[PDB]
Structure formats: structure tokens, C-alpha cells
Design a protein around this ligand. Structure first.
Ligand SMILES: *[C@@H]1O[C@H](CO)[C@@H](O)[C@H](O)[C@H]1NC(C)=O
Ligand SMILES: *[C@@H]1O[C@H](CO)[C@@H](O)[C@H](O)[C@H]1NC(C)=O
Lengths: 650, 535
């Protein structure tokens, strides 16, 4: 019973080549098939909506990756923009061998997809983060395709106003992929946040935005920051920790400052109302730009009882601290805030996102969690204990317990053995010593009576660096020895980047070479056939941030502490011929009152680079169709097909 | 020179270039950030580098951003001394025109600064310039260590008095188009000053389950009369799915299976063509005009997909014209074998109903006619439909007709562009017949009437089409809906037309123009608002 397999990302993008996978199985090995794939829209009489491309592969080479291009000229000739309810397009596979041999109803098989005009990467940058009315604003753009290369398409630059209003728009085509523009802010606009948005002219929803805020200001001479002794405050009954905070005031050129610092306290609720104290106000003299302030438990209890709130009512209240340091003999002053200081009953945070749902019977279930202190870096060396409770329908629920200590990156990998024919699994994760954080979840077993499942295990249990060779092992579960080969695919950014076949042995170790393509997160889906029913499992694998591939280095003539009016010969290094957009920015602007929006770094580049991912969740599913869809892939075997995604995002 | 950001340039890189820059005259820690875009490799951002510039001995100034003219100013140059020895220097502001110095000239002030400390000197200078005046202060040093500094920051003074904002909220409509804004007339206007005016305009912009209708997709089979009961529902379902774009919900290959089946049906009924293309129930049996009109409409509807021959249907239309009588009416030379697929036709009157159906059929046949050639045929069919419309309008004016007849005549006159008076009287009669989403399990006749009425009202949607379309949808949602044949096809067409009417979007443009006769000349502006808000 041969079948044809159609593989394609659930969402296609206009103007970029589309990766489509076609597979053969249960082939008598003595025949060769030939056929073509293309896009067509049913509502416009099935006009060929994309250029034809064929596979014409045989049984000896049953796998073939096809690079199908989707020009926008066909798309606008296709009437795709003329649809009425959702951008829904049909992908089909035409071949006469499907009708004459398999005696199907037609010589064609397809899938339902959703198209979106969003494509490429557009990066925005502003001259300075903080403005005041009456200056000239500079900015520049970068045009980049899906493959992270400069593009020469046409974009439209739009300048938004404070009230969600448009002030200035321009269109320009970039032969150098970089475009510069000037813009003068009106001298009457009220202090508020603005936005610059740019999008490709041919596209519609490919817009990218940056925010620069304008406010009446004068650049300060020194910044003051308040560093609490501990980022969290334990409010468990019986025991209360001491609250102490250090006031540091430094000149913008690094020298210490002297003066007097004035502090007032208060309380912050969820919405943001302020409720200050009386009599807690401390005035101290700075010494070498450092000052330590602490409050005794007794005075804090006196303040709470005077305000009559109650210690037990600090479940989510935020302690408020304000700084009113005055620099003498200058006389000028500025403020600082410590909004991010909560009252919590536990010192640690628990992450349960990476651990997969939809347990698989007969294979060692894996639990993943990330321990991290509140408002801080991930912490190391914290014991974590779990109480696994198997819900066996035919016996008493067994309780299995096991602990492990933090690796160092905050991650935990504690495999737990699960028996067959279970109803569900409930477990409780506790980390902390003392005052542990409790996070409990339950997962139901897949429905019984189906074919044997597939198990994926990762030996190293660590995120590999770029250039390594991660290894995976596969084993079938249940009486399903009928098959002879394993099929596996690698997904990244909603594109089929690698496809291969592996034979069956007692141990089936599959090696994948991670490269710059598989960054920052690549999926991994593998499947086999239990006669006719497809069965599959998937495993999301993260990739370390790594470094660049263009190798930009920027350096100065060391730290000589140069004086004003001097000259510095800057040194810069690149791996390839490139264009560098240097920007020199004063740090005192960061000290100016703002949300301190971080400048452009590798993190945002990776996030937008991965923003095209389709699949959601750690992976793994009950049926083959569900896990295939959850991995952001469209599936159609001729008997079972994937439903269209309900919306662009999960 | 006190900028906030200066190194704003782009250059090429050949793995090595040594650009020498000049430090701006300030005392901060400047951070340089760069981005590289490579055609081969890609985009990388440099690690931030901090280029801390520092002068061991300096003076710092902070001019307030706003200083009202004629009002007292306090100026506080502060001395910073990180040296190791106590300095006794002099501070004096250079005499500049437009400003009254506290000392009124270059008069020096003596102050000693101990090491690692600061010493401010108060100054009281009231501005007297117009817009902006440059000011520089000098801190001249002693013989013991001749160190000095001079800072020159431009001091800008705002205009006289406070600022005022005027708001004129208004609403715009396609009556009351033109409106006039009165000119500025507030008596507190100061004769000299700025006058900035901005315009702020805001756009202020405000089915059936495909599974059931999919079952109607059936292979053609049977004799010359059992074939239509399988092509008409098939064509109707294909049109409904195509025009409501529900093919995506269905399995992808159904549409190709559908076109294969419709091609097979087109071939199957084509083989029963007579010499005159009347398409009788049997080759030996006499032709029926109702069957021929049904064929005409269904093949004309399907002709947009199947590659048929236009001239082979023009002769069918001509033969149909040969069956018109003197008053424009039509009669069947031979009745159908089964009256089940006539449905609403049977009743007190048939000739009015039959003529309405024929008129619907012919108008669907105008589209398939070639634009080149057959001009006499087009003119004669137009004359025929004009005579038929005249007869049907006379019958409608006679009234006392059935609900099915009234609805189908209303639709026929509406689609044929009948004279306005006849359209009005037919519409009035149909509205009078309308019964109260309750309108008209329902039999075949009632859904016939509702579908035809919905087509008329669509060709005539204001609180009415949706309310009866909901009734038609609820009736069709019943399992195995549209039991008969022609009710199926017209109801599917009705839902398709209603659904396209419901979901349709316009440009929603609100272009406005502003023009005035200033003393400096005449100006005009245009503000597109097709798709946001503009100022
Ligand atoms: C494009 O702009 C719209 C404005 O409503 C915004 O919602 C959307 O997130 C933007 N798209 C991006 C940033 O990709
Ligand atoms: C500066 O003045 C203080 C006043 O007590 C004196 O002790 C110190 O020695 C002086 N320093 C120099 C370098 O003259």
C-alpha cells in the first residue's frame, strides 16, 4: 500500500523560495515516479499560481528536497490579494502515477496552507535614545532577507507621532541596502513616546518598529543608582529578613562624588499607586561615593502597624525607595527609583516550560526545569526534589522520589522511568533549602489502542555550541518491528533544511551537525510506519548564542584616559568586505529619566531571526497529526491530512 | 563644542583601516557602537567600547533650558579641582553685548580651591538680548601651576510671555460638506511672535457548513433526465464552494475531483444534442423548452471553466428564441416526464413562472456570446428579452399571482434592467406579500420563494437581506437540506450572492483639502486617508 508524503511548513512567505518535502514509502522498489508540485488557488479556477517544479525520483532514492520559488508577480496575477476571509492558499502535488497505479480518485494530492506577505528582516536605529523638542533626529535602516544578507528591495519609511499619528513618510530603493534620513521634531510637541516604522513597499505586514522617546530635559552631570543588598525580601510568617540598601553616586567620567543623600520610603501596589511612610526618612553623608542604609525589623513593624496594613498582606506589594541626593557645593540634584523590589515568600523561581508534555509509555520520561533567583541571574548548586506519582489504573498509585543538584546554568535533567498502561502522571517539583518553591503539574497518558510510539533521548543534555555534532538515539516501543528504516527531518525558521533516511538496528544513533543555519533553535522530527498508521515524535533543541560569522572587532588604543581635543586611531577588524555604521553616544543620556531601553545587540537579532518559527511548545504529541502540526509542519499522506492553522501565531 | 552624538558615518572595510578622529570638547565617557553588514557573511554588531575622555581640571556649566527675558537669572559656574595642590585662580565672565553682567564688565573674582574639592561662584546676569546670546567664562590660573579652562555655551532666551493652544474639534461627513474655520481673532495676540498651525484628522473607521454541501458533489449518471439531477446540484455546489472559498476546509483533492466530475457531466449531456441543440429528455422524445432553458443556464454558468464551444450554444439560444409567442410568452411543446424537478413551477399558473425562468436563462446566455460576431443574434435576443420583460411586467401589474411567481418575476425584471416603474410595482407587491427572522420543516416551494426574494432584494441589503438570509441559512442547516433539485441550485446561488454582499470592503477614503488666502499668497494641501491618521 504505497503512499505519497507531502511536507511543507504550515505558513509560506511570499517572495522567498519555499522548502517542500516529498517522500515515497512501501514502494515495490522496481518503479520510478515522476510528477510536479506547484501552488494554485481554488477560488480562481485553479490557475497555476507558482512556476512548475518536478521531483521525478525513484525508490532507490526515496527522499528529495525541492526548492520551490514563489514570485510575487504570479501572486498578484493569482488574485491572492483578492480573497475575502483569511489568506488561505492551496499547495498540490500532481503526478499521473497516483491515479493509474494506486487507483485513487484523482492524479493529485495536496495540502492547505496560510500565506503571509511578511518577509525578510528590517532593522531600525536612532541617532540618540532620548530627545527634547527642537532638535534634528537622525536614523538609518538595514534591508535584510530571510538568509540574513543585504537586500535591494524597496521600502517605505513612516514616522509615527506621540498620539499614534503620522507626520512624515518616504519611499526609497536602496542599492547599497543602507539608507539614511534626517528629521526635525516640532518644538511644541508634548513629552511622550514616538515610533519609527518601516516596511517593504511590495509587502504589507512586514513592518518593523523602533521607539525613541522625547522629553524636556537637560543632560545631567552624574548618575546615582540604588543597589539593594538582596533582590528579594522573605515575608514568610515567623521569620523576616533585614532590609539594607547601598547608595552609589558616581560622576559620568568615573570619579567619586561627595554630598548628602536623602531617601524616602513607600509602598507600591499592582496598579502603581504610591503610599509613603512617615518618620522613616534617613539623611546621610556620602563617603567616597558610597553609603549604606538599613532598616531594623522593629521600626519596619512600627511603620506597618502605624499604617495598619499588616505583615501578612505583603503578598505582592513592592517596596518603594526614592533618592533625593544633592551634590554640594554644586546645589543641583536628581532622583532615582527602586520599583523592582517585591515581597516574596520564596527566594527561587521555577521554570517548567522546557519540559515536554504528552508522556510516552515504555520510555524514560524526562523532566526539565530552570532554577533562578527572583530578579537575578540563574543560580547554581540548589538541590531540587520531585515526587513522581504514576496513575496506574490497574494498581495503587506508586510514588517515586529522586533529587539532583543544579548543574550551574540553572538547568536540571532528571530522567524518570515510567511503566506501561498508565492513566496519567502527576508530579511535584520542589527546589529550595529552606523555603522551597513549589510547582506542580500533571500530564495525561496518550490514548491506548494505537500503534507503537517513538522515543527520542538526548545523551549530553546540554545545549551544544555551533560547530559540534549532537547525537540522538531512537528505539521503537511495542510490537512494531514491521518497519525497516527511520525517517527524520530538521526544521529551522519554518524551513526544511535537511532530510535523510536511517536503517533499523538495535541501537539507532543519529548525528546532526549544528551550524549557523540551525540557530538559535532547531526542531527535530522523526517518524516511522506501523504498517499504515504514521507515528512520530519531536524534540526541540536549543543552540547557544555563539558569536558572529562576520567577525566585527572594535577596539581603541588601550585605556590611556585621553584628554579633550586629542586624537585616537580606532582599530576595527572584519572577516569579509563589509560596511560599518559607527555610532558614538554619550552615556549621560542613559542617566536621563527613561525606561532605559537597551540598544541593538545580538539578542534582538537572534530574536527577530527566530521570530519566523512556526511550531510552539517543547514538542511531542499524542497522534502523528497533532505532533506534526505542533512542530509547525503540514502533513498529507493521502488518507490523513493536517488542518490549517487558525492564525499566524500559536 | 558639546554634542550628544557625532560619529555618524558609514565606510567600507578591507580588514584594516585606521581612521583618526578628534575628541569632542566634553567630559563624559563616550561609548562607540558599530554594526557591520557583509554581502557574504551577514550582519554583526560590535561589542560596545567605552572611550572615556577626562580632563583633570575643568569647569562645568548647566544653563537652564528656558530663561524668561527681563527676569532675574542665577548663574553658577562651579570649579572642579582633582589636583594635589591648593589653587588660587580667578573667575570672570567676558563682557558681551546684550547681557548685563552683575559687575557690568570684565571684573575678576578671587577664590582658592583646596585639593580634591569644589568651589562655586555665584553670578547674577539678567538677559537683555532678543533671541540668543553667546556667553563664555574664563578661569585663569596662577603662576604656581598655569592651568586654565574656558567654556562657551550658547544661551537661548525664549520669546515674551506664555504660549497658548487653540483646539477646534469638528466632524466630517460625505450633507454639510463644506465648512469654514474663522481666522484668529483673540485680542491677546502679541504683534510679533511665531504662528504655527497644524491639522489633525482622524479616520475614525468603524454562513453554512461546507461539509454538508460537499456531499452534493456526485458523479453524473442515468438517462437524459436523470443526468441533470446530478449535474445541477454538482455545479451548484462547485460554484458555492468556489465563491465562498470553502475549498480550503475540504480536503485539497476534492476540487480536482469536482472539476473532473463536471467535465464528465459536460461530456455526458453534450452527447444528447439534437440538430437544433434543444437537449430533450430523450433523442427520440420531443424537446421541452424548460429543459432547454435549464441546460442553457447551467452550461452558461459552467462555461467559465470547461473549454466549450461558444457557437454551439448560440444556436441553442437562437432555437429558444424560436419558441417565443406574440406577447413574449413561452410554452412547453412537451411536459417533463417527472414534475418533481419542477417544484415551484406547478401550481395555479405556470406560463408566468416558465417565462420568468426562461428570461433568467437567456440573460445568463448573453455572457457566453462572443463580443465579435453574432451581432444580429445579440440584437434579436435583446429584443426577445425586452418583449418578455414587457409581458412579465404586465402580468405583475395585474397582480393576484403566487408567491413563487411574484418572487421569480421580481428577480427576472431586476436582473434584466426592467423599466423603473415596473421594477417599483413588482418590488412593492413582493414587499406586501412578505410575511413576518421568520419569513414565508419548510417545503420546497417556500425555500424557492425565499431564495428568489433574496436575489431580488440583493439586486434591488438594508436590515432586510440579512434577516431573511438567516432564515434561509437555518433552513438549509437542517440535515439533508434542499431536498429537491432546483431549490438546491438557486439557494446555493442565493447564499453565495448574500455572502459576497455581506463581506465587501471599500477604499474608505476621506481626502480633504485646506486652502486660504494669506497675505503672502495662496496655498493648498491634500491629505489622503485611504488606509491611519495624518498631520
Ligand atoms: C506593524 O504595525 C502594527 C500596527 O498596528 C503592529 O500591530 C504590528 O505588530 C507591527 N508588526 C511588526 C512589528 O512586525
Ligand atoms: C590646602 O589647605 C589646607 C588647609 O588646611 C592645608 O592643610 C593643605 O596643606 C593645603 N594643601 C596644599 C597643597 O597647599
Amino acid at each position: 500500500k504505497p503512499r505519497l508524503l507531502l511536507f511543507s511548513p504550515s505558513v509560506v512567505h511570499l517572495g522567498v523560495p519555499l522548502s517542500v518535502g516529498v517522500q515515497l514509502q512501501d514502494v515495490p522498489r522496481g518503479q520510478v515516479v515522476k510528477g510536479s508540485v506547484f501552488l494554485r488557488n481554488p477560488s480562481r479556477n485553479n490557475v497555476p499560481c507558482s512556476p512548475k517544479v518536478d521531483f521525478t525520483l525513484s525508490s532507490e532514492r526515496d527522499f528529495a528536497l525541492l526548492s520551490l520559488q514563489v514570485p510575487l508577480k504570479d501572486a498578484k496575477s493569482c488574485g491572492l490579494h483578492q480573497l475575502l476571509r483569511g489568506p488561505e492558499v492551496q499547495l498540490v502535488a500532481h503526478s499521473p502515477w497516483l491515479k493509474d497505479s494506486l487507483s485513487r480518485t484523482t492524479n493529485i494530492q495536496g495540502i492547505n496552507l496560510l500565506f503571509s506577505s511578511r518577509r525578510g528582516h528590517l532593522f531600525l536605529q536612532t541617532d540618540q535614545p532620548i530627545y527634547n523638542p527642537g532638535q534634528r533626529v537622525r536614523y538609518r535602516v538595514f534591508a535584510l532577507d530571510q538568509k540574513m544578507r543585504p537586500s535591494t528591495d524597496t521600502i517605505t519609511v513612516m514616522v509615527e507621532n506621540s498620539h499614534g499619528l503620522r507626520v512624515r513618510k518616504k519611499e526609497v530603493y536602496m542599492p547599497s541596502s543602507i539608507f539614511q534620513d534626517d528629521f526635525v521634531i516640532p518644538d511644541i510637541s508634548e513629552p511622550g513616546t514616538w515610533k519609527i516604522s518601516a516596511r517593504f513597499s511590495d509587502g504589507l505586514e512586514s513592518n518593523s518598529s523602533t521607539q525613541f522617546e522625547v522629553k524636556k530635559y537637560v543632560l545631567p552631570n552624574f548618575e546615582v543608582k540604588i543597589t539593594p543588598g538582596k533582590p528579594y525580601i522573605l515575608t514568610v510568617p515567623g521569620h523576616l529578613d533585614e532590609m539594607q540598601l547601598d547608595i552609589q553616586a558616581r560622576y559620568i567620567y568615573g570619579k567619586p562624588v561627595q554630598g548628602v543623600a536623602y531617601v524616602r520610603f513607600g509602598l507600591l501596589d499592582e496598579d502603581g499607586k504610591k503610599t509613603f511612610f512617615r518618620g522613616l526618612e534617613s539623611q546621610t553623608k556620602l563617603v567616597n561615593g558610597q553609603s549604606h542604609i538599613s532598616l531594623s525589623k522593629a521600626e519596619f513593624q512600627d511603620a506597618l502597624e502605624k499604617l495598619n496594613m499588616g505583615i501578612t498582606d505583603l503578598q505582592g506589594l513592592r517596596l518603594y525607595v526614592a533618592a533625593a541626593i544633592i551634590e554640594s557645593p554644586g546645589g543641583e540634584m536628581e532622583e532615582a527609583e527602586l520599583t523592582s523590589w517585591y515581597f516574596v515568600s520564596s527566594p527561587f523561581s521555577l521554570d517548567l516550560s522546557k519540559t515536554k508534555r504528552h508522556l510516552v509509555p515504555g520510555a524514560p520520561f524526562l523532566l526539565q526545569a530552570l532554577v533562578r533567583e527572583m530578579s537575578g541571574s540563574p543560580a547554581s548548586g540548589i538541590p531540587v526534589k520531585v515526587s513522581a506519582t504514576v496513575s496506574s489504573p490497574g494498581s495503587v498509585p506508586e510514588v517515586q522520589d529522586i533529587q539532583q543538584n543544579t548543574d550551574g546554568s540553572g538547568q536540571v535533567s532528571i530522567p524518570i522511568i515510567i511503566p506501561q498502561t498508565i492513566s496519567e502522571l502527576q508530579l511535584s517539583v520542589s527546589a529550595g533549602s529552606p523555603h522551597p518553591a513549589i510547582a506542580r503539574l500533571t500530564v495525561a497518558a496518550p490514548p491506548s489502542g494505537g500503534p507503537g510510539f517513538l522515543s527520542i533521548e538526548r545523551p549530553d543534555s546540554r545545549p551544544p555550541r555551533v560547530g559540534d555534532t549532537l547525537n540522538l538515539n531512537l528505539r521503537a516501543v511495542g510490537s512494531g518491528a514491521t518497519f525497516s528504516h527511520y525517517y527524520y527531518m530538521i526544521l529551522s525558521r519554518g524551513q526544511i533544511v535537511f532530510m535523510n533516511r536511517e536503517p533499523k538496528r538495535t541501537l539507532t544513533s543519529v548525528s546532526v551537525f549544528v551550524d549557523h543555519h540551525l540557530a538559535p533553535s532547531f526542531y527535530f522530527v522523526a517518524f516511522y510506519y506501523h504498517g499504515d498508521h504514521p507515528v512520530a515524535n519531536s524534540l526541540r533543541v536549543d543552540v547557544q548564542a555563539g558569536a558572529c560569522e562576520g567577525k566585527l572587532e572594535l577596539s581603541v588604543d588601550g585605556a590611556k584616559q585621553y584628554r579633550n581635543g586629542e586624537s585616537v586611531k580606532l582599530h576595527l577588524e572584519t572577516d569579509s568586505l563589509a560596511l560599518v555604521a559607527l555610532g558614538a553616544l554619550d552615556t549621560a543620556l542613559y542617566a536621563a529619566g527613561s525606561k532605559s531601553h537597551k540598544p541593538l545587540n545580538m539578542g534582538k537579532v537572534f530574536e527577530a531571526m527566530n521570530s519566523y518559527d512556526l511550531g510552539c511548545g517543547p514538542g511531542g504529541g499524542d497522534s502523528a497529526l497533532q505532533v506534526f502540526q505542533a512542530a509547525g509542519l503540514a502533513f498529507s499522506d493521502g488518507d490523513q491530512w493536517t488542518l490549517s492553522r487558525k492564525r499566524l501565531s500559536c | 563644542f558639546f554634542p550628544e552624538n557625532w560619529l555618524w558615518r558609514v565606510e567600507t572595510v578591507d580588514r584594516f583601516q585606521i581612521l583618526t578622529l578628534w575628541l569632542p570638547d566634553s567630559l563624559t565617557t563616550w561609548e562607540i557602537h558599530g554594526l557591520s553588514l557583509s554581502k557574504t557573511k551577514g550582519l554583526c554588531v560590535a561589542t560596545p567600547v567605552q572611550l572615556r575622555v577626562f580632563r583633570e581640571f575643568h569647569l562645568h556649566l548647566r544653563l537652564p533650558m528656558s530663561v524668561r527675558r527681563f527676569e532675574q537669572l542665577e548663574l553658577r559656574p562651579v570649579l572642579y579641582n582633582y589636583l594635589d595642590k591648593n589653587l588660587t585662580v580667578s573667575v570672570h565672565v567676558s563682557p558681551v553685548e546684550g547681557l548685563c553682567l552683575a559687575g557690568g564688565g570684565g571684573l575678576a573674582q578671587q577664590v582658592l580651591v583646596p585639593a580634591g574639592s569644589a568651589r562655586p561662584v555665584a553670578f547674577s546676569v539678567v538677559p537683555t538680548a532678543a533671541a540668543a546670546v553667546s556667553l563664555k567664562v574664563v578661569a585663569r590660573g596662577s603662576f604656581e601651576f598655569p592651568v586654565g579652562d574656558a567654556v562657551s555655551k550658547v544661551l537661548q532666551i525664549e520669546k515674551e510671555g506664555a504660549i497658548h493652544r487653540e483646539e477646534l474639534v469638528y466632524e466630517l461627513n460625505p450633507r454639510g460638506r463644506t465648512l469654514e474655520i474663522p481666522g484668529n481673532s483673540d485680542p491677546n495676540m502679541i504683534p510679533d511672535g511665531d504662528f504655527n498651525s497644524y491639522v489633525r484628522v482622524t479616520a475614525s473607521d468603524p454562513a453554512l457548513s461546507p461539509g454538508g454541501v460537499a456531499s452534493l458533489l456526485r458523479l453524473p449518471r442515468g438517462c437524459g433526465e436523470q443526468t441533470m439531477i446530478y449535474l445541477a446540484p454538482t455545479l451548484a455546489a462547485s460554484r458555492y464552494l468556489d465563491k465562498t472559498e470553502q475549498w480550503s476546509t475540504l480536503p485539497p483533492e476534492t476540487k480536482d475531483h469536482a472539476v473532473d466530475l463536471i467535465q464528465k457531466g459536460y461530456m455526458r449531456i453534450q452527447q444528447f444534442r439534437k440538430a437544433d441543440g434543444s437537449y430533450a429528455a430523450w433523442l427520440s422524445r420531443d424537446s421541452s423548452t424548460w429543459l432547454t432553458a435549464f441546460v442553457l443556464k447551467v452550461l452558461s454558468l459552467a462555461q467559465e471553466q470547461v473549454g466549450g464551444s461558444p457557437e454551439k450554444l448560440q444556436e441553442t439560444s437562437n432555437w429558444l428564441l424560436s419558441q417565443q409567442q406574440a406577447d413574449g410568452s413561452f410554452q412547453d411543446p412537451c411536459p417533463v416526464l417527472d414534475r418533481s424537478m419542477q417544484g415551484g413551477l406547478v401550481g395555479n399558473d405556470e406560463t408566468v413562472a416558465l417565462t420568468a425562468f426562461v428570461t433568467i436563462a437567456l440573460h445568463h446566455g448573453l455572457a457566453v456570446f462572443q463580443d465579435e460576431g453574432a451581432e444580429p443574434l445579440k440584437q434579436r435576443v435583446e429584443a426577445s428579452i425586452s418583449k418578455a420583460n414587457s409581458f412579465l411586467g404586465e402580468k405583475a401589474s395585474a397582480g393576484l399571482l403566487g408567491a413563487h411567481a411574484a418572487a421569480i418575476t421580481a428577480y427576472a425584471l431586476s436582473l434584466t434592467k426592467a423599466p423603473v416603474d415596473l421594477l417599483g410595482v413588482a418590488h412593492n407587491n413582493l414587499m406586501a406579500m412578505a410575511q413576518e427572522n421568520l419569513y414565508w420543516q419548510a417545503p420546497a416551494l417556500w425555500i424557492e420563494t425565499t431564495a428568489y426574494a433574496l436575489l431580488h432584494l440583493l439586486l434591488h441589503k438594508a436590515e432586510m437581506a440579512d434577516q431573511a438570509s438567516a432564515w434561509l441559512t437555518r433552513q438549509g442547516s437542517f440535515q439533508g437540506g434542499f431536498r429537491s433539485t432546483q431549490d438546491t441550485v438557486i439557494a446555493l446561488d442565493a447564499l453565495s450572492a448574500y455572502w459576497i454582499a455581506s463581506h465587501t470592503t471599500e477604499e474608505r477614503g476621506l481626502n480633504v483639502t485646506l486652502s486660504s488666502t494669506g497675505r503672502n499668497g495662496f496655498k493648498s494641501h491634500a491629505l489622503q486617508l485611504n488606509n491611519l491618521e495624518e498631520e
